[PDB]
Each structure stands twice: as C-alpha cells, then as structure tokens.
Amino acid sequence: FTIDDFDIGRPLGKGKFGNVYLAREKQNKFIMALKVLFKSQLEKEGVEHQLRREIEIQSHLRHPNILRMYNYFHDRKRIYLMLEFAPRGELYKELQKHGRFDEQRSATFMEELADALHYCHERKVIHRDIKPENLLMGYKGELKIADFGWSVHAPSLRRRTMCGTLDYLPPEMIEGKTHDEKVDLWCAGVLCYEFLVGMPPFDSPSHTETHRRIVNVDLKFPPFLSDGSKDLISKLLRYHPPQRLPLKGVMEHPWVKANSRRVLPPVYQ
Amino acid sequence: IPAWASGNLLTQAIRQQYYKPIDVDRMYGTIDSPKLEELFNKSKPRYFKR
Ligand SMILES: Nc1ncnc2c1ncn2[C@@H]1O[C@H](COP(=O)(O)OP(=O)(O)NP(=O)(O)O)[C@@H](O)[C@H]1O
C-alpha cells in the first residue's frame, strides 16, 4: 500500500507522533482510520522498539472487540497504520458525557472486554493497561480495545515492569512483585466500578494514598450499586492474583448474563 | 472536507459497511507489508523501470 491508495477525509484526532485520519481506500471504497507517525519524531523519542512490539501484537489479533490493524506501510518520512474505524469514537468521552453508565451498558462492555481479553490470554498476550481511555466504540457501540502500548507477549516468564495507569495499578505492581496475566483481571474490576460509578474505586488526593488504598483493597461501594454488580467487582478486585475471577467467569457471571445486550457484528460472508 | 466524509453520506456509508462486511482477511491480510525491522529504514519507491 501507499498513501495514494486512499482518499483522505478529515482528521479524527492528534496523536503524539502524528494525526489519525478518516480515510477511504480507493479501490474498495472501504472506510478506515489511517494513523500517521513521523519517523524522525519516533527516533528522537527512542520509541522504535516499543512501536515495533505494539504493531507486532495488534496486527496479529483478530477479534470483534479488538480494534483491527488491517496492514501498514511507510514512505520516506511517515509510518502509516491502517486501522479499523470506530464510528462512535472514544469510550472515555461517552463516560464523561453521561457521568456513569447504567447496568445494561456496563454489563455489555464487561462481556465484550472479557471476551477480548480471553482471546488475548489464550495467546499469552497481557494487555496491562485496560482503562476507558484505551477503548473505542463500534457502530452499534461495541467495545474495541484500541491501545496496546503496554501489552506484552509473555509465554513463560513472569514480568516485573511497573506499567499501566495509577488508579488501575494492581497491588502486585505497587509492591514490586512479579506479575502475570492476572493483572488484566484486576484492571477489569476497576473498569467495571468506574463504568457504574464514574470514578475509580481508589481515587485519592495523592499517589501514596491511592497506592495505600489499592494494596489494602479499600473498596467502598456506593449505595446505589446493585448486589450483582458489587458481586462481580468484588470477585475481580482480589488482593491475591490467583483468587481473582477468571475471564470466563466474568462472561458467565449472573449479573453479566442478566444485563448484557452484547451483539456480535456481522462478518464476511 | 470532501462530501463522502461528513454528516449523512458518511453515516450512510458506515451503516452500509457494518451490514456488508468485506473479506478484510483476504483484501488486506494477503497484501504484502514492510518487514517490521525495515520500517525505519529506506523507503523505496513503488516504480522503478527503464
Ligand atoms: N480507529 C479509530 N477510529 C476512530 N477514531 C480514532 C481511531 N484511532 C484514533 N482515533 C481518534 O484519534 C485520536 C488520537 O489517536 P490515538 O491512536 O489514540 O492517539 P492518542 O489517543 O492521542 N494516544 P497516542 O497516539 O498514544 O498519543 C483518538 O483519541 C481518537 O479520538
């Protein structure tokens, strides 16, 4: 592919290394997003290896709830990623606009998330930064995991890297322990709470107080939450990684079953 | 902004695409890609013959 295979429509957003454009591939008139990255900026920042790893991971995943990277190409100055267009845009914007999601919307997102994450884990990919800002939304509002920045393929070894986002950090990262794929189970629980409440569960005035709340699992449920939703969150936000509810458990949880209105997109044929 | 990319023509084309998915695996996934280790190296132009 080259840039002249596409009609450029309009900017969708400014990334750190270039813009993302709404584009239409000329030959099939197929609408996609083209993410443009400047090679010199990437090299200056020293992110080449990180970018390679992110592309290597995202470009080999095929799931309805993971944003697809169809292909990629480069020219003299730019690297171009050909991505699935998410017509309903950023999840975080929707949550901010509404303040909190209702149970139906939240359960639906949870089922989609757990399915995408299970797909990942079956391939020994750990995501490591699930939060609303890393999620986009499809035509029917389907969750799409979009940012694989912190992800890793971890076939054998446990990991040590502190990664993710303050409010979402699992206790084991804060304590300097090794971690595994169960980090994603914890983050799923933080996400479910934020969806329903509109604030993450360990919100605090300082980074040290947030860490303290996390490692103590100082979870205080607002009285408006349903017993089912509290049950799921409680089962994900376990101090001990091995005790967290598995992703198949999230999919099977009664609150998810009773409230989710998940619909699988049409597929070719 | 070209017309295809705004308001209604866009809305309409997105709907159309959701319900008539293309064989992306074939249409994009069989097409060659640059090696990852070559992304930061020399871009060679598409055409060179004499
Ligand atoms: N596939 C997409 N479909 C629709 N909008 C997109 C898509 N990808 C990116 N965008 C929009 O483009 C914006 C910036 O792109 P993104 O890849 O997120 O960079 P960012 O969010 O600024 N983070 P980074 O690129 O890491 O700085 C996003 O916030 C979206 O609003």
Author numbering:
A (entry chain A): 88 to 356
B (entry chain D): 798 to 847
Original authors' sentences:
Mammalian cells possess three Aurora kinase isoforms (Aurora A, B and C) that exhibit different subcellular localizations and have distinct functional roles. The most conserved C-terminal region of INCENP (the so-called IN-box) is sufficient to bind and stimulate the catalytic activity of Aurora B. The CPC complex is involved in numerous mitotic functions, and the timing and mechanisms of each of these events are carefully regulated by its localization within mitosis. As expected, deregulation of Aurora kinases has drastic intra­cellular consequences, rendering these kinases attractive drug targets for small-molecule inhibitor development, targeting the active-site binding pocket which binds the ATP substrate.
We sought to investigate this further, and grew crystals of Aurora B–INCENP in the presence of a nonhydrolyzable ATP analogue (AMP-PNP). We also report the structure of the same complex bound to a nonhydrolyzable nucleotide that induces the formation of a crystal contact mediated by the substrate-recognition region of Aurora B and a neighbouring INCENP molecule. The C-terminus of a neighbouring INCENP molecule occupies the Aurora B substrate-binding region of an adjacient symmetry mate. An unexpected crystal-packing contact in the Aurora B–INCENP structure coordinated by an ATP analogue is also reported, in which the INCENP C-­terminus occupies the substrate-binding region, resembling the protein kinase A inhibitory mechanism. During the structure refinement, we were intrigued by the precise docking of the INCENP C-terminus onto the Aurora B substrate-recognition region. Although unexpected, the crystal contact favoured by the presence of a nucleotide within the Aurora B ATP-binding cleft may resemble the inhibitory mechanism observed for protein kinase A (PKA), in which an inhibitor protein (PKI) was originally co-discovered. Our structural data predict that phosphorylation of the TSS motif would disfavour its proximity to the pThr248Aurora B residue on the activation loop.
